[PDB]
Amino acid sequence: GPSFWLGNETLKVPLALFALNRQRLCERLRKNPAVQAGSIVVLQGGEETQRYCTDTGVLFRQESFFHWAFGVTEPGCYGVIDVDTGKSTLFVPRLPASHATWMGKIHSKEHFKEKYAVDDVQYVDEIASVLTSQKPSVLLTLRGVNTDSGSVCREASFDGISKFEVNNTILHPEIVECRVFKTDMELEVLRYTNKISSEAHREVMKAVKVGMKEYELESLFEHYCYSRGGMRHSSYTCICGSGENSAVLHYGHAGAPNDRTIQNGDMCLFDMGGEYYCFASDITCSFPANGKFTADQKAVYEAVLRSSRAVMGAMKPGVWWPDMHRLADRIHLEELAHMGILSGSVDAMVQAHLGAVFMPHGLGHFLGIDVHDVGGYPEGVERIDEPGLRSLRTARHLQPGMVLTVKPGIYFIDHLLDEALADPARASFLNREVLQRFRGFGGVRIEEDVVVTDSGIELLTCVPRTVEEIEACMAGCDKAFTPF
Amino acid sequence: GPSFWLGNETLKVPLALFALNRQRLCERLRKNPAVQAGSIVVLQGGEETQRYCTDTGVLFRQESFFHWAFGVTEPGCYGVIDVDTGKSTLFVPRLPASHATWMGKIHSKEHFKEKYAVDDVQYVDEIASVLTSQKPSVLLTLRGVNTDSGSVCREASFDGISKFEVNNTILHPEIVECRVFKTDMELEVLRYTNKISSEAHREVMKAVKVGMKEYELESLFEHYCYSRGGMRHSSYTCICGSGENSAVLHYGHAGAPNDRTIQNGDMCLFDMGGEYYCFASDITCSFPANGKFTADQKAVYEAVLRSSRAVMGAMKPGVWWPDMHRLADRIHLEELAHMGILSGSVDAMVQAHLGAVFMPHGLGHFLGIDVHDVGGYPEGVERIDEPGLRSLRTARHLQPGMVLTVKPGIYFIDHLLDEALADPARASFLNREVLQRFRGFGGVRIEEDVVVTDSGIELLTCVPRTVEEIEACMAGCAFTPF
Numbered sequence: 001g002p003s004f005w006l007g008n009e010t011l012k013v014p015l016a017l018f019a020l021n022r023q024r025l026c027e028r029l030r031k032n033p034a035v036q037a038g039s040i041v042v043l044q045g046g047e048e049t050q051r052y053c054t055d056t057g058v059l060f061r062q063e064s065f066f067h068w069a070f071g072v073t074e075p076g077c078y079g080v081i082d083v084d085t086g087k088s089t090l091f092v093p094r095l096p097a098s099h100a101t102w103m104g105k106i107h108s109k110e111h112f113k114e115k116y117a118v119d120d121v122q123y124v125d126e127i128a129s130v131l132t133s134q135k136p137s138v139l140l141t142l143r144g145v146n147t148d149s150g151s152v153c154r155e156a157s158f159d160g161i162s163k164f165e166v167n168n169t170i171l172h173p174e175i176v177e178c179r180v181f182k183t184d185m186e187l188e189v190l191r192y193t194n195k196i197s198s199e200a201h202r203e204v205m206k207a208v209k210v211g212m213k214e215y216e217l218e219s220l221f222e223h224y225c226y227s228r229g230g231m232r233h234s235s236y237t238c239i240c241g242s243g244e245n246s247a248v249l250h251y252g253h254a255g256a257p258n259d260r261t262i263q264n265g266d267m268c269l270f271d272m273g274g275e276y277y278c279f280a281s282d283i284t285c286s287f288p289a290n291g292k293f294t295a296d297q298k299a300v301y302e303a304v305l306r307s308s309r310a311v312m313g314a315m316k317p318g319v320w321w322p323d324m325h326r327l328a329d330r331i332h333l334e335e336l337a338h339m340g341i342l343s344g345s346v347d348a349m350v351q352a353h354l355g356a357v358f359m360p361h362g363l364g365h366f367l368g369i370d371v372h373d374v375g376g377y378p379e380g381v382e383r384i385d386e387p388g389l390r391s392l393r394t395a396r397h398l399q400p401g402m403v404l405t406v407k408p409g410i411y412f413i414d415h416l417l418d419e420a421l422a423d424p425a426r427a428s429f430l431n432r433e434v435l436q437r438f439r440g441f442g443g444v445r446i447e448e449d450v451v452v453t454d455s456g457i458e459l460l461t462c463v464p465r466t467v468e469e470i471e472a473c474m475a476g477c478d479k480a481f482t483p484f
Numbered sequence: 485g486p487s488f489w490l491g492n493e494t495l496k497v498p499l500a501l502f503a504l505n506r507q508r509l510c511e512r513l514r515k516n517p518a519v520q521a522g523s524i525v526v527l528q529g530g531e532e533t534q535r536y537c538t539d540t541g542v543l544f545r546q547e548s549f550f551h552w553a554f555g556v557t558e559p560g561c562y563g564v565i566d567v568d569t570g571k572s573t574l575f576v577p578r579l580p581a582s583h584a585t586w587m588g589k590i591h592s593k594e595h596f597k598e599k600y601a602v603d604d605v606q607y608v609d610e611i612a613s614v615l616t617s618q619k620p621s622v623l624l625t626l627r628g629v630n631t632d633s634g635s636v637c638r639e640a641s642f643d644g645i646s647k648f649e650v651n652n653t654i655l656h657p658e659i660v661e662c663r664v665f666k667t668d669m670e671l672e673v674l675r676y677t678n679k680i681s682s683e684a685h686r687e688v689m690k691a692v693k694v695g696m697k698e699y700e701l702e703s704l705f706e707h708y709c710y711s712r713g714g715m716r717h718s719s720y721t722c723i724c725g726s727g728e729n730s731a732v733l734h735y736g737h738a739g740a741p742n743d744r745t746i747q748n749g750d751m752c753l754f755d756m757g758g759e760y761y762c763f764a765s766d767i768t769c770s771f772p773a774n775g776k777f778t779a780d781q782k783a784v785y786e787a788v789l790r791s792s793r794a795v796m797g798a799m800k801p802g803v804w805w806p807d808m809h810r811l812a813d814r815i816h817l818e819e820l821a822h823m824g825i826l827s828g829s830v831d832a833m834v835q836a837h838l839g840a841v842f843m844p845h846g847l848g849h850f851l852g853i854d855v856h857d858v859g860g861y862p863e864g865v866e867r868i869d870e871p872g873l874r875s876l877r878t879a880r881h882l883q884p885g886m887v888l889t890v891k892p893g894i895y896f897i898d899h900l901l902d903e904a905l906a907d908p909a910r911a912s913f914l915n916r917e918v919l920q921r922f923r924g925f926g927g928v929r930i931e932e933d934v935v936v937t938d939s940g941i942e943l944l945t946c947v948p949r950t951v952e953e954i955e956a957c958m959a960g961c962a963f964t965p966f
């Protein structure tokens with residue numbers, strides 16, 4: 001069948017990938033007691049947008065549920081799926097003649113049918129007529145709450161939909177659950193996004209020089225990803241934190257826009273991941289700006305390397321993800337004590353939630369169509385009300401087919417450290433004489449993308465990780481490393 | 485005073501630029517007989533957004549009127565200007581403690597006051613209280629219609645604004661008119677955006693090889709602009725049309741995403757412009773993919789070079805922009821006749837609107853903080869309902885301080901050609917046997933950015949333009965990323 005491809009050495013993605021997602025969704029819905037015969041799933045694609053009130057077009061990126069079901073790159077579409085038969089119909093915009101002048105060829109419906117390997121193609125303005133002719137029992141539309149943003153998914157609507165029976169409660173948890181479990185075809189794409197982003201991270205490590213602006217490496221990363229990988233988008237805004245900025249978890253946004261000059265002695269924390277055909281990657285590399293770890297940098301870095309590898313070694317089906325977070329916390333505390341930053345009983349440190357001072361974010365999250373992927377907190381799964389753990393984006397147990405980021409880190413964040421020092425329950429663990437040395441250090445984060453398998457995990461990411469490997473890469477020796 | 489700067493060799497932009505814009509706006513408003521004493525201009529800045537229902541942040545780019553007045557890069561702000569005194573107050577978000585963990589330093593109000601060189605800074609949640617104490621007659625807010633998008637400008641609103649008298653009609657025409665005329669400080673930024681984008685176009689011409697994907701050059705262009713120019717954004721989505729795609733005017737969008745392989749014998753039409761601190765550039769270069777113009781390519785290319793230079797040579801204060809568009813049409817028709825594509829009276833061709841078959845878009849437009857800048861069709865300036873001219877984004881007369889793109893082109897667009905061939909009023913001019921050879925040629929566009937001066941224009945763009953210059957540039961043996 002047909003494939004999405006951007007030529008050169010980019011990945012051919014079979015449109016069969018999306019056909020399989022539609023089949024899986026129907027199979028799940030048919031087993032749902034709330035679903036009656038003759039139901040039709042109705043999804044609305046994203047539309048073109050502009051900057052504010054201007055005619056400056058914003059580059060269109062498809063809505064993630066719609067992409068998952070159809071793989072369609074054009075704005076203004078709808079898509080429906082007959083649950084009982086699996087029959088898929090794509091609705092495409094009926095374009096004005098002038099489109100041919102300004103935007104390009106006005107493709108036929110048959111062109112789109114062949115391109116996307118759907119069963120039928122119709123024009124958007126015909127959706128009420130076409131659905132009326134099929135005499136559905138109920139239309140199943142998308143509405144639910146994203147547990148990372150708090151936003152409500154946009155339910156499909158069209159002229160005449162009020163004449164149909166519409167249910168907007170059934171679909172969301174079911175299509176979310178399908179997205180949680182990646183197919184082998186989806187894993188092929190995520191292997192590829194990790195391949196290209198890993199290569200780009202290695203090029204950045206080779207290119208980094210003291211005196212550069214952070215954004216020079218953002219630019220280089222995205223250029224590798226696009227020109228070599230066909231990744232027109234990143235999965236999220238690049239985080240290129242040097243020096244103290246490496247303690248800022250989502251550094252690089254408009255308010256802190258990767259605009260610091262990299263200094264000798266700084267640590268760098270570069271959290272970047274290209275997106276290919278709306279599939280994510282998320283990789284974080286930490287390294288010394290000048291290519292040589294100091295003793296202090298090595299100690300903090302290897303503490304996080306230890307927790308990274310311990311978690312990857314422990315992950316397998318049945319493991320409760322919050323237990324992996326607590327494992328990372330315990331290892332960070334052990335290593336911070338071994339460094340002289342902390343002293344006393346590590347058991348007592350754990351009981352006092354001291355780990356969250358140094359890692360105030362969740363250990364990792366689902367990854368897929370969205371970098372913070374859906375389904376972390378389905379009904380019944382509760383957020384843990386403790387420091388650090390409350391920021392986990394899932395409290396689920398691991399099962400084969402899930403894709404997770406594993407992103408432990410240690411940071412020196414002044415207001416968190418100062419809170420701890422003001423707190424009798426935590427203050428005694430801290431050795432200020434040693435800690436003062438790490439004020440303004442920033443932090444280290446080491447992030448891998450992995451698949452949960454029957455036997456453990458498959459590591460997708462391929463970047464240098466030991467001190468020796470990283471120093472070699474920065475010296476231009478990027479291939480001299482061996483993944484976990 | 486303070487300046488915006490992204491280090492290295494990037495441009496230092498004084499915040500005085502925005503203070504001058506605020507002064508100019510107040511001066512204009514004070515002369516408006518409808519404006520009451522004690523009026524306060526109230527603008528609302530852009531807010532952070534995400535992709536659909538996800539938590540995937542979209543990189544924030546400031547709303548253009550707000551940027552013009554304040555130069556503020558942070559989301560979630562408001563800004564007000566006392567019309568009578570010119571006093572400026574910026575309102576910034578009161579951030580939660582956790583911002584320091586996730587997003588960065590929680591700057592003081594004093595930090596923002598010094599950064600932006602405004603008269604005062606307050607928190608957004610105090611805007612009603614602050615405005616109340618100033619006892620304004622009327623709040624002047626922004627509402628009007630953009631004549632390129634047809635969208636309505638988003639009017640400022642805040643909790644408690646209902647307690648004020650608000651006028652949303654006066655401001656828009658006045659702040660639009662101010663934006664039409666660029667200050668010397670604004671022109672310095674537009675010289676810089678043209679400089680970097682010109683350099684990036686030259687690098688692309690040197691890098692193009694047969695067999696590359698169009699998007700490889702989009703990527704290279706944006707990388708040059710960001711890494712060397714500090715241009716995090718482009719002014720618009722890059723248009724990298726090779727072969728027949730060079731006839732597609734806004735090629736490169738998600739539906740036609742710069743994904744063709746460049747072939748031997750193709751013409752390339754690359755329309756790209758980096759954005760610096762929300763100031764635009766817009767440059768188009770046309771050239772043969774293989775570095776050597778054929779006879780047919782040279783003829784079409786030099787026709788557009790001729791109209792480009794003729795229009796630039798005629799531009800000066802008082803010139804009616806639609807007359808320049810018609811000048812370009814007449815030149816294109818003359819040249820297409822010399823080539824043998826057309827035969828007959830060029831006068832009669834013009835009367836039949838044949839020029840619009842080959843150039844269906846407007847000759848050019850205002851450029852500034854938006855690439856299609858505001859103010860092309862103020863009240864009293866009408867759109868001309870004729871082929872080609874109806875797509876002009878302004879029908880104004882030129883005045884000093886206006887910044888315009890000059891972008892003639894000739895394209896071979898099947899459905900326009902087919903219409904013309906069916907129409908007896910136009911078909912007689914077209915020589916089918918010659919035209920057939922140019923089906924699938926694509927097109928040529930040559931686009932310069934210029935400023936109207938007291939006596940003529942100033943050219944901002946600097947790329948190779950003659951056939952000799954282009955061939956020498958592409959044969960050049962500087963920018964090696966990895």
Ligand code: PRO
Binds near residue numbers: 249250362365407
């Ligand atoms: O938002 C999150 O969950 C991770 C934590 C470090 C940066 N991104």
Ligand code: PRO
Binds near residue numbers: 845849877
């Ligand atoms: O939209 C416009 O006015 C110009 C025409 C060529 C492409 N951009």
Ligand SMILES: [Mn+2]
Binds near residue numbers: 272282283284407447
């Ligand atoms: Mn990340």
Ligand SMILES: [Mn+2]
Binds near residue numbers: 755756766767768931
């Ligand atoms: Mn242009």
Ligand code: NA
Binds near residue numbers: 205206207473475476
């Ligand atoms: Na190096």
Ligand code: NA
Binds near residue numbers: 716717759761762
């Ligand atoms: Na900029």
Ligand SMILES: [O-]
Binds near residue numbers: 271407447
């Ligand atoms: O991350």
Ligand SMILES: [O-]
Binds near residue numbers: 755766768891931
């Ligand atoms: O253009």
